[PDB]
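Why do we bother with holo predictions? Because pocket geometry can differ from the apo form. Keep that in mind while you read this record for 2-acetamido-2-deoxy-beta-D-glucopyranose.
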Amino acid sequence: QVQLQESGGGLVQAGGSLRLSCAASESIFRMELMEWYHQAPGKQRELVATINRCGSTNYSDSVKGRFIISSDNAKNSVYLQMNSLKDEDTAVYSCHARTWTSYWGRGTQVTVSS
Amino acid sequence: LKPFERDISTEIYQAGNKPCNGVAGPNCYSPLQSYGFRPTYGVGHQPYRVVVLSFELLHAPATVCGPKKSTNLVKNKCVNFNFNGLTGTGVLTESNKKFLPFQQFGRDIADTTDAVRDPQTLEILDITPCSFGGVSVITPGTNTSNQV
Amino acid sequence: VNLITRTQSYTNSFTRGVYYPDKVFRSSVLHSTQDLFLPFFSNVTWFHAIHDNPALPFNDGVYFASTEKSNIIRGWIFGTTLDSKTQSLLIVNNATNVVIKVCEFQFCNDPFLDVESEFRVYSSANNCTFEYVSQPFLMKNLREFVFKNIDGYFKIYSKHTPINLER
Ligand SMILES: *[C@@H]1O[C@H](CO)[C@@H](O[C@@H]2O[C@H](CO)[C@@H](O)[C@H](O)[C@H]2NC(C)=O)[C@H](O)[C@H]1NC(C)=O
Ligand SMILES: *[C@@H]1O[C@H](CO)[C@@H](O)[C@H](O)[C@H]1NC(C)=O
Ligand SMILES: *[C@@H]1O[C@H](CO)[C@@H](O)[C@H](O)[C@H]1NC(C)=O
Ligand SMILES: *[C@@H]1O[C@H](CO)[C@@H](O)[C@H](O)[C@H]1NC(C)=O
Ligand SMILES: *[C@@H]1O[C@H](CO)[C@@H](O)[C@H](O)[C@H]1NC(C)=O
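The structure, written out:
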């Protein structure tokens, strides 16, 4: 079975709110890092947010003040909060996790209409 | 049973699917059988009294052993030592090692004792083997001279 | 009397739970050992009790950890059925001594100390086969304990460490 499974995609008008969630079959403790990448049609991949094992969290320049990334130790998953979306936020998102090799996921095509 | 374990509980053993319900009926027995000892039995059936003595090796400070006198302690001399049954020969000197309270020995790469704790006074000593080496003989031919 | 409620949260153990395997001094060497250890990066079921089925399984061994300072915690109970039909432990600590008894206690649903009578721990014990008295184990701080049993031998390790303000 696939390890990382993502959910939370769809169509959402500008100024709304959304929740992206990617869950891992293995425990999220040993994964040592979890990041969210997104890419727009015809553009290159850029990092959105990253959270390490200790608890340090980092985001991108165009991400601060609107997005929050956090995980709970009840169901092994990582959540990202989509707030104050604009037109350029329309992209495809995928979460990545590396214990000793990198694991990737697919899906979650989110669109914003303006 | 696991090693060195006892059982005292008395109950009605069940050898069937139905519960015993506290009565020794069908498929219900008492797992405590009494020996029948008589003086006219054969040798293989007579009662035998058994006592087992179990020894614990040296990991902690020793407490039980025979009547051996304890002599004086000497240092900086190639001497024979017998520390709590550990016997050897060497030179005993003062120690800079920081033994923890629960530790009693000290080991090296070859897994031989090199730091000991004195049983009477809680002091640490370091053991080094006495001096030794090899000898070579340089001589001309015996047909020439007898000097070496 | 049932007056205790409990919740469970989950967290990790990081790099903790290493103990000296033997009482032999070693220095500047790397030693390979094989024994009962707590694996790195494992679940630790953080229990919270407020005022309940606290019959937690024992399995091979147990690593216990506590960070409180009020010393509201004291002692432990061990057994296989927690009834008078089988022998059980009564490791109990207070400010002056620790008593350890192996006997056929009739344990109640929830044991506690009135504070200082243990009448609510057991009803009556009859056939005791082991007694022991010593100095109590427990003495912003984290206290760690390791309990295990091998070949009829119960082994208890402990450690005290200072911990700053960390959740
Ligand atoms: C610790 O292990 C337990 C046992 O698997 C995990 O708790 C379960 O997690 C799954 C995740 O989908 C859910 O069924 C419940 O949250 C738990 N099951 C229960 C309570 O019966 C737990 O996820 C592990 N710890 C972490 C951080 O993942
Ligand atoms: C101890 O308890 C277990 C659990 O019920 C039981 O199966 C076992 O027979 C008992 N005795 C030994 C030696 O394990
Ligand atoms: C052992 O006895 C000797 C002689 O009485 C004494 O000098 C020494 O201090 C004693 N040591 C201990 C640990 O009792
Ligand atoms: C602690 O328990 C021991 C065991 O009997 C008892 O003697 C002692 O009085 C107890 N401590 C206090 C402060 O009562
Ligand atoms: C101990 O066990 C025996 C036999 O199992 C039983 O008859 C007795 O009542 C028990 N209690 C005492 C105090 O002897």
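The pocket of 2-acetamido-2-deoxy-beta-D-glucopyranose (ligand 2) is lined by residues B 1-2, 5; C 80 (CB under 6 Å).
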